[PDB]
């Protein structure tokens, strides 16, 4: 059995064994397969059932509908754009020259204009899976290296960081760029501070910022959001800034982009951000379970609504971004993904109930502000979250100082 195996090779990884340096890896595998079987020793002789393993497994399971819809949407968008541009012999030559396309056609799928959901999800998988594998392996290398050098034990948190990072990049991102981004996010933002539970910044949005500011042409523009060869097309946030609600049109199909399309997820963009419906279904479960903060989510919504309504009331004659309402701000860009799965990081947020409201309000206000009045960037969720990561401790300081004054007044 596996249990007798894991208790038979245990001596090799204790001091004095042939494998006394891989003890961290052995302990990780052993405690993954079986529970530790330990007992309490000091007090509170009974403990709660929850642990970091469940805390992160629920969050990993919460993004499955978004991930699968993103795979399907990437495949379908690529197929539609390719059949728009090319036809017949040129389509055959294009397919033969790209391994994604000919592997999709070799695994039983089809790349013609009448493809099914299976073929579309297969094509999207051929883009998602290599990125996720590269991210996980490259980040795991650094995590294990730091654990071995500093004699810690490997811990969860990268389990969530890897998938969250792989779900927020364009489908056409180079693998070497993904490796560089995950390296920066894991090492600089998290590992030098002590590891999980000891950083102050968002590791998944810190590598994405590295990519955003170091290699901009591969994470921005028109050529990176639909995985079609030789296809150029703008996205909904980049079309509203130019022309308002009348500029939202899907060029590949000639159909206007509607609110239902944006809400369901029938739009190009990053892999996992597109389906607000799926993101909401995923986030409701972890808000109910008590892992994510409804205070943070409500604060983000409050700030977004307030600023997006003030801009509408003020109005403008030259900026078409001034008249986008809140229900349109909600279903475009990475707003829903960020507000549901990145703003709710417990370690980077505020530690006080009073400070979480201000944290969320700041995130929403900053996101809407960068969307509207900053002409360089069409979206601002990553920058807004990275900006509020710096001022959360100040909200905590203000709340704590009020509490200390109350305590000194002998009424608390």
């Amino acid at each position: 059995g596996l249990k007798k195996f894991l208790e038979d090779i245990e001596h090799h990884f204790e001091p004095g064994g042939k494998h006394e340096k891989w003890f961290a890896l052995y302990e990780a595998a052993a405690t993954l397969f079986y529970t530790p079987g330990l007992v309490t020793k000091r007090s509170s002789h009974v403990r709660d059932s929850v642990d970091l393993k469940r805390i992160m497994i629920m969050v990993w399971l919460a993004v499955f509908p978004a991930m699968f819809w993103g795979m399907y949407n990437a495949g379908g968008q690529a197929i539609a754009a390719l059949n728009h541009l090319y036809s017949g012999d040129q389509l055959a030559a294009i397919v033969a020259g790209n391994w994604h396309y000919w592997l999709t056609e070799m695994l039983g799928g089809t790349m013609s204009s009448d493809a099914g959901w299976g073929s579309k999800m297969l094509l999207g998988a051929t883009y998602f899976l290599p990125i996720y594998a590269t991210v996980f392996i490259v980040g795991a290398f650094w995590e294990v290296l730091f654990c071995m050098v500093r004699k810690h034990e490997v811990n969860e948190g990268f389990f969530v960081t890897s998938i969250l990072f792989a779900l927020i990049v364009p489908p056409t991102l180079p693998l070497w760029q993904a490796a560089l981004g995950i390296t920066f996010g894991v090492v600089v933002a998290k590992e030098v501070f002590g590891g999980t539970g000891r950083n102050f910044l968002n590791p998944a949005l810190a590598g994405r910022a590295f990519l955003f500011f170091a290699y901009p042409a591969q994470i921005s523009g028109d050529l990176v959001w639909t995985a079609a060869d030789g296809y150029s097309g703008a996205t909904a946030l980049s079309q509203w800034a130019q022309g308002g609600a009348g500029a939202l049109i899907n060029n590949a199909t000639g159909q206007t982009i509607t609110w239902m399309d944006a809400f369901i997820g029938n739009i190009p963009g990053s892999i996992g951000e597109v389906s607000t419906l799926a993101l909401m279904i995923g986030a409701a479960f972890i808000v109910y379970m008590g892992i994510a903060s409804w205070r943070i989510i409500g604060g983000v919504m409050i700030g977004m609504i307030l600023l997006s309504t003030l801009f509408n009331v003020i109005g403008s004659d030259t900026n078409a971004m001034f008249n986008m309402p809140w229900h349109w701000h909600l279903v475009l860009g990475g707003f829903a993904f960020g507000m549901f799965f990145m703003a709710t990081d417990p370690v980077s947020a505020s530690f006080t109930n009073s400070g979480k409201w201000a944290y969320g309000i700041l995130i929403g206000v900053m996101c809407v502000l960068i969307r509207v009045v900053n002409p360089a960037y069409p979206e601002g969720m990553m920058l807004a979250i990275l900006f509020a990561n710096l001022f959360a401790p100040l909200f905590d300081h203000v709340v704590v100082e009020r509490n200390i004054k109350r305590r000194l007044a002998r009424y608390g």
Binding site: Y34, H45, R47, M289
Partner: protein, 446 residues
């Protein structure tokens, strides 16, 4: 009336039946030396010495004048010492009924006695160790007074006994103890209780306060936080209902009253109930043939904050009023962390167990996971009812920032106030010991 809304009533199995019955005959008692905060003993007896009831066993080096006396008459058979010769227990084998007697007063003479006379009688009898001072939970110095004495006539611990059943037997002793405390205090006496009726003292400065809600609605720390906040220059004293009955009996009869009514309960107890016992009774003889077979842990006190009773420590504590017995969770499950927990208790909602309201769990001594860092998903705020910042205070306790923890409110706390915080931590921290380290550092610094 104060209603506590943040807390946790722990649903552990084997709650006792609130009917009193006599317990097993007990042949050994002991005084545990490690349970007194800031105490260094000076021995007055040695192995083989014959003692009497209320005869002094040892004194305190750091608290001049405080005497720790013998619960019963017998012979000193063991003086247990551990690492660096630290005293663990002074065990007495019961034989005979010799005792040391004191002065006796009428029922109506107690409310007007001299404070110095009351203090002298308590110190001589050794009943002065029933008191504890907030901050630092130590025996009061015999040359100090306080403006508030808090009587704990309620019990919200898991599997705890009902104070009403015990007090209703000893109404006269309870009232006499209240009168003595009213004469002893310089300010008021706070009787913290539930909504049921108790015998009442007629002194104007004895006031009954009613607390509602789950645990910790029945803790002296909560009562101080809501009625008389404590700081460096405001110090309060604590005592419970059994010790107040003992004080009343001492001042009414001239004899030390060492009887106890503790609760024997737990998931592995055949007949959970209340049993009459004696101070510092031997737990291995108290629980003799009372439990199911297997490997179990016997706890002196609650499971949230108690002392493991094994070896030289297998005796009833001074401030404990129950015995908790439960199994040992040494099992290992395949992918156990990923199973749907219909039989798993959590303050979160990640398990199926919370969907069965009223369910009762056969809990064991398992740590459901491994030690990790703090990822604050917001569990301490669900269980701390006080007006503090739980996550931040705990992080200063973990980091060892004692100066900041004092500002954040550590001086108001005891190890029993962070028991639920230790309970619901996903990182398997233990905050009572961290709080004790911080308080020791503050005390020694000056």
């Amino acid at each position: 009336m104060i209603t506590i809304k943040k807390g946790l009533d722990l649903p552990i199995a084997g709650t006792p039946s609130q009917v009193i019955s006599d317990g097993k005959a007990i042949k050994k008692v002991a005084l545990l030396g490690e349970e007194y905060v800031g105490m260094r003993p000076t021995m007055h007896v040695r192995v083989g010495d014959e003692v009497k009831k209320a005869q002094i066993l040892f004194e305190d080096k750091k608290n001049p004048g405080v005497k720790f006396t013998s619960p019963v008459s017998g012979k000193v058979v063991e003086i247990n010492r551990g690492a660096k010769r630290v005293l663990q227990s002074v065990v007495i084998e019961v034989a005979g009924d010799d005792q040391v007697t004191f002065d006796k007063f009428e029922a109506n003479q107690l409310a007007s006695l001299n404070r110095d006379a009351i203090k002298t009688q308590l110190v001589e009898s050794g009943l002065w160790t029933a008191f504890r001072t907030r901050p630092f939970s130590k025996v009061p110095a015999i040359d100090s007074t306080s403006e508030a004495i808090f009587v704990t006539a309620m019990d919200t611990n898991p599997l705890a006994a009902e104070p009403t059943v015990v007090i209703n037997e000893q109404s006269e002793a309870f009232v006499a103890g209240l009168d003595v405390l009213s004469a002893l205090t310089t300010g008021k006496v706070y009787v913290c209780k539930k909504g049921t009726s108790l015998p009442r003292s007629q002194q104007p400065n004895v006031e009954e306060h009613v607390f509602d809600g789950p645990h910790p609605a029945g803790l002296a720390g909560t009562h101080m936080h809501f009625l008389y906040p404590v700081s460096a220059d405001h110090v309060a004293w604590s005592i419970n209902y059994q010790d107040v009955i003992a004080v009343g009996q001492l001042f009414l009869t001239g004899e030390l009253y060492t009887q106890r009514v503790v609760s024997l309960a737990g998931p592995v107890v055949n007949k959970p109930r209340l049993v009459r016992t004696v101070m510092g009774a031997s737990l291995e003889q108290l629980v003799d043939s009372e439990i199911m077979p297997g490997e179990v842990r016997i706890i002196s006190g609650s499971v949230l904050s108690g002392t493991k009773a094994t070896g030289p420590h297998a005796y009833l504590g001074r401030y404990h009023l129950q015995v908790s017995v439960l199994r040992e969770g040494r099992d290992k499950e395949l992918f156990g962390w990923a199973m749907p927990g219909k039989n798993k208790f959590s303050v979160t909602r990640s398990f199926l167990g919370h969907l069965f309201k009223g369910q009762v769990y056969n809990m064991t001594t398992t740590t459901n996971g491994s030690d990790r860092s703090m990822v604050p998903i917001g569990n301490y705020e669900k269980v701390m009812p006080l007006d503090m910042e739980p996550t931040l205070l705990l992080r200063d306790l973990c980091a060892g920032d004692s100066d900041s923890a004092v500002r954040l409110g550590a001086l108001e706390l005891d190890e029993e106030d962070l028991a639920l915080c230790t309970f619901v931590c996903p990182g398997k921290y233990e905050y009572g010991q961290l709080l004790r380290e911080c308080l020791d550092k503050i005390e020694k610094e000056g």
